[PDB]
Symmetry: C3
Amino acid sequence: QYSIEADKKFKYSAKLSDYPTLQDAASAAVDGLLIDRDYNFYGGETVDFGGKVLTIECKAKFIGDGNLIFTKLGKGSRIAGVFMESTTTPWVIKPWTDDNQWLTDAAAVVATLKQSKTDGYQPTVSDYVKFPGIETLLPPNAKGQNITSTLEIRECIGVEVHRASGLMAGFLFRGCHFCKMVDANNPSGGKDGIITFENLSGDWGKGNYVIGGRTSYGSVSSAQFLRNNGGFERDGGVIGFTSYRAGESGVKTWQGTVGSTTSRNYNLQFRDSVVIYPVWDGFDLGADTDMNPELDRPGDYPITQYPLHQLPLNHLIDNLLVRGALGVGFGMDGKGMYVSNITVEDCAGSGAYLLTHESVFTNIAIIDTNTKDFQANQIYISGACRVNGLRLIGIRSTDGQSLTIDAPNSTVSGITGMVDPSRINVANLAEEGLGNIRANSFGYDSAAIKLRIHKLSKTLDSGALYSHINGGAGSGSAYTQLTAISGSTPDAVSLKVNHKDCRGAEIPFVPDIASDDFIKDSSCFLPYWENNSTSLKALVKKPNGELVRLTLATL
Amino acid sequence: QYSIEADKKFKYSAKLSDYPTLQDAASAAVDGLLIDRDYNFYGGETVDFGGKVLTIECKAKFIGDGNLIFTKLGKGSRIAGVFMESTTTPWVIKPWTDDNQWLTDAAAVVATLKQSKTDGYQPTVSDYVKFPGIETLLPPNAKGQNITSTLEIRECIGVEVHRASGLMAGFLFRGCHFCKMVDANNPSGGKDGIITFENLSGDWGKGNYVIGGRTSYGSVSSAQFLRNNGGFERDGGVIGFTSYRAGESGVKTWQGTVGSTTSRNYNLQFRDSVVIYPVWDGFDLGADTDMNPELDRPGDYPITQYPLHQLPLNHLIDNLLVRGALGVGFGMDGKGMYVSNITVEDCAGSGAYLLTHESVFTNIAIIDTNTKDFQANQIYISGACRVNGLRLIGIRSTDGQSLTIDAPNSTVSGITGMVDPSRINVANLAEEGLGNIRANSFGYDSAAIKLRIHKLSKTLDSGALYSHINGGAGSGSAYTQLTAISGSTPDAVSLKVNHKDCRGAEIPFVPDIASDDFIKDSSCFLPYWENNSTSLKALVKKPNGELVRLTLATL
Amino acid sequence: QYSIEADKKFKYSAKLSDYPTLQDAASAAVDGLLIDRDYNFYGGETVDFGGKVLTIECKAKFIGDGNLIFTKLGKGSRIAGVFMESTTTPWVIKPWTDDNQWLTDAAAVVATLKQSKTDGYQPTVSDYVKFPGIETLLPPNAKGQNITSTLEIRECIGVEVHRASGLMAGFLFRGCHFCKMVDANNPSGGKDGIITFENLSGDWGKGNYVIGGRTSYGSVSSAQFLRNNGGFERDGGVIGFTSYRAGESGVKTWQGTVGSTTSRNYNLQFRDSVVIYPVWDGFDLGADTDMNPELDRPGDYPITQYPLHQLPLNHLIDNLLVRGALGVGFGMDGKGMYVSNITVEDCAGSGAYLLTHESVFTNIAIIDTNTKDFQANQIYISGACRVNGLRLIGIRSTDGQSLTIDAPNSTVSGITGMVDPSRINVANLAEEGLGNIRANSFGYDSAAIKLRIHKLSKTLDSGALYSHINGGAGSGSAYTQLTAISGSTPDAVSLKVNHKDCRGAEIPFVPDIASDDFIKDSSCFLPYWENNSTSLKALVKKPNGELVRLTLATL
Ligand SMILES: [Ca+2]
């Protein structure tokens, strides 16, 4: 019988073109399921896949506003090529120019309004803060919109969504474990987060990843996590991902209470990823609320155990790039954190906002940030942290008085760049382990090794060692100078060696009668001027510590 | 009826073993298409896939010289495992030894000639420049060869080629958008570029990527782009890729006019990638022609708007590694660029050749490059740029007079390595933001903090602060010395503190009668020698600025 | 005839549910093979796939202790979703606490014993060394266990295993070439290595990679190689991989003789990867045995050609992260190596153990390692190497006398961090290419530029340049001080400029009659005390080099 042989030798796949509803096709499926016609779904339409391990291959669109809900997929199920699209074409704003300059003026942003499923985003309430005054100026038809076409995977284990795309599209994993969003094929976002792992009910989320791929646009954050804990195994997070033009942030771990419980996250990886042109932040990896925080943490550690911003979040954070944020490039909180290899460039707000304590930051580069003076500084650290390697300043100038680094409880080593030293505030700055040193000077007739005591003055060097050309180039002659500040005049007092190639030391003397207390150490002398005789005298502290006054030079 | 049920329950796939031509199989296909026998194609053979969204699975070879042309594939089509192979076995050169040393002598290169589809490449005209004299020495049968077996995807949107391989193989996307070359499985290249996105006609290319994978050999560049613009979204470029032994360069964005229009590229990503042993360059990301440039840019911005090498290319460039180039490791041009985290090692030409202006380079490492003295320097920057963090020198020495960095308009901070300071040329070099410092000296009886004024001398230190051992190790005693250059003799003039553990300052004096102009500042004195009385005198500039001469020390 | 049309239009797949043995299903398969029921295999069960190019899709478990052996798969075959599981539930140890602190006490480790297929590992003989005393304390039923369920690919070319997982699971490629383990889906390991490329027989392994994915647990190493050589093309190794909690090491290239031949490896890539919480080492990339080494290298280069630890291994090593090792973070040997961009944090043994010679290390960060004092240092280098950029110290203190870096034959530049300078030992340390410098001091009333001659003292600075506040903050006045050590008392002897805002130089003098030899240079004077007359004298070395004694200051 051919049918016996056929049933044994051919691959099983059901296809949607043979069925009137998606549930009918799902029920028929045994191995493969092919989406080979566009399918209009109603919001909340729910498909039961019977616990089957299905390979779902999409070659057409799921069309609808609201959520298409997939349930009871077997472990190992895979959904490839899915394409979500809204039925509604909403009003979107586009707060950047044709030369990719951010628009900050509310009226200019309102002028960008158009009806489109892409190239912009639907305003939300956070836009009222981001573009002050815009709430009053937006037409009512552009406020409070709620358009997203969302694929919801509900309460499944071991399901992977690969190469997803769409228009006004979102992807929600609700109450899932060991699920992955892999190689997202640049979906264009809607009102809700583009990729969400939300585990507010049931067990803490674990094994949930965004791996590879990219997203564009969306009103809020591109990739986000609520109530996930990767365990000590660090089994979850974001690796190899790119976010472009998030309406809020590129990658976000939620903070505070959502509903009746914690939305926070522990033990996730954030590695090898890039966020470009977010309207708010590149990476927002905080767990506690900054402004107007909850007095408790239902479902999480109490404030009595860990103070605000001091949770043992224990994320693995490495090799991240942010460029072009209108908000903050990289933000986090927590205690006992290690963070490495972070690069932030060209952000309008702070490059880094770090509400961290007893944490270590290694090889950080913050290059041309706070370019619009939105924050007090380019990098802020609240608690007692360590920074080992910090690159500051690209090519931008700073006209006002804002600090570059304000990390008042932190100890820092290894700053590089053309930082204005008056714009550094740290607890301690040191290079303990340098070798033999050479200061090489270009474009000047001198070289300098300067000292600045910030307690005395943040703006004036307190002393210096200089080398200065005698005559011109090629003269083979220079003079060395040791200086000290007096009367807030840098270099006011100095000793010289070889000025005008004289081969001698020029020694400063006290310009009047020296007081007893002017001399510091025993077996030393201090020259001073006696004008009434045209003589140099010496105040001498003898080897035995007693003072005597001698005549040093006479007419 | 079984046939009704069978048509509903089984996956559709056509296979080439059932058809006499590839077009017949393509026409029959509805979902899958299996290449299950080797297929000999003629150059220019064109397959029309009818707009169908096909999953093409290759388990055999496409064999032929020239192009196999795929057209009218539906968005979402995928081609996996394709294997291209030429019919011709050409003559190839192998310009490296069994110890992986580059051959540079033309006669030695000619001696490597063999007929093979791999382990070398077909000479092209660029080899005549790379190996001077080789044009005369190559036998005629090894010149002007043109063997490539090329899969051409023509005027398609949303097509992905995955896990491709081959021998004398190339992959061309001509007039395509939103197409990807994913996880290339080490094809061995032919005469043409291995992976090309060419958009000289139609709309500018966008959404075109090389993601993952690797290539080997080829006569010209491994991955290349013509007339692509990723948009502000940076939707295209090269991520996660490895090139080995390109006959020209690993990754190339074309420069200048090709045909009648621009071949240039904007807004692409070049990230997380590696180029090893290219015959020419690792990354060639320039857009304007260097030698003998066009006087115009048909199809692009005019020279009147942006001068040569000053286009707003706006690529996203980060986390690149190059090793073993016979040419330049990393090259680019453009204005307003940000570049980060570039590592270049062991190149025979310059590590970096940067025809850039108003651009920022952060965390650059150029380690043992220009090892064959092909260029004037290891890193060159033409325009007014900023470098923040620059590692120079591995373990190689430099016998001649070539510069290490020549960046005469650039401001630089954060050099590390055993650079010869005479081989640094920059506009300005500074460490503005160091903390308290310690110079730790090993393998010497002294420690040093030296100063060098490059305007005075690039080769001689102009002054120093030294600490020198008194006696031997463990003596608990050292002397401190402040020095200045005179008569081109470093350290010619000095003041000492604690020489021979004497607990005193040794002060240099003018060895003859001091001229009036030798003293600089008021309320200072300058000792000088009066030989005719065996006396020290003091030239004194009094507190009121007037000069007087006093007797300082007498018999 | 429908059967003719059906045979042409449907995809071929055989499925295990239709057959009594795996061999029966394999024999029936032509294109696809679906594993759609759990399959109990016996150890050594061998399947012959007839040279067919098969796409094997797994949606169920292979269950058994021992090896399931796949042979004669055609080039291009793929195995997806495989899940290996043992029949035995062994006794496992879990040497870490509920706060993720390592357990080091043998009795505490024994107390963790449980029967499970995961969340720990089976003890092996290396545990007897790691937890001293544990050999005596372990119950007999927890010693010498040998449970692994291993998929063995034997003597195949061009086979890829994708998205594999399991419990007590291993994956062995024995005598294979051009094979890949791709996107491992966190298999939980057993007694043997989780991913092994072993080529002890036949040709040296080539083209063998681990790409992407992750593993957890296992008694020994996560990914390992024996007798592989990637060629100059670097065609093999580990890229994009994560290892968690290896019972030995994350990534290992074997050392020494195994059986009758070499187990060593050449020309592999180790890039873009992460190892966390290994019981032994993060990356172990050595080739020669350290303790009690072989006197020969059968099958490899003789000791007469390359001494122990000086093989030309030529691996491409870049962009690696290790955190939380109980052993060493990063270890290797070899001569002529280049290594870049390595980050190691929070390891109980050395961050790096480098038995390397004539090798270059660029941009290395070793942050809070040797935290349990297991080794003599945080980073060790035996041979004559170069280090360009080395970050040391996070937030941990060191109570004892151990060194931070011991690299006694190496030349180093670019240390950053709060290193204790007495804990640096190198051949030479230098910053040759710094610009104009500023020392910025926070939290002190002074700024300092110190000098330390390690030959004199590793613990005491030998001289200094200080700037000190006169009075208080905002006074606009400081004094500069130049000091030298005497009698092992830092700063014992000093010259001051502007002490107490006096505008003069305080000059130290010899406290008794100066000996002739106390003066160094011609045309200099040295003041000294004559107590019997209350006078300063000057020992003068005249311009002609002859000595004279003069009266300098008198009552
Ligand atoms: Ca006198």
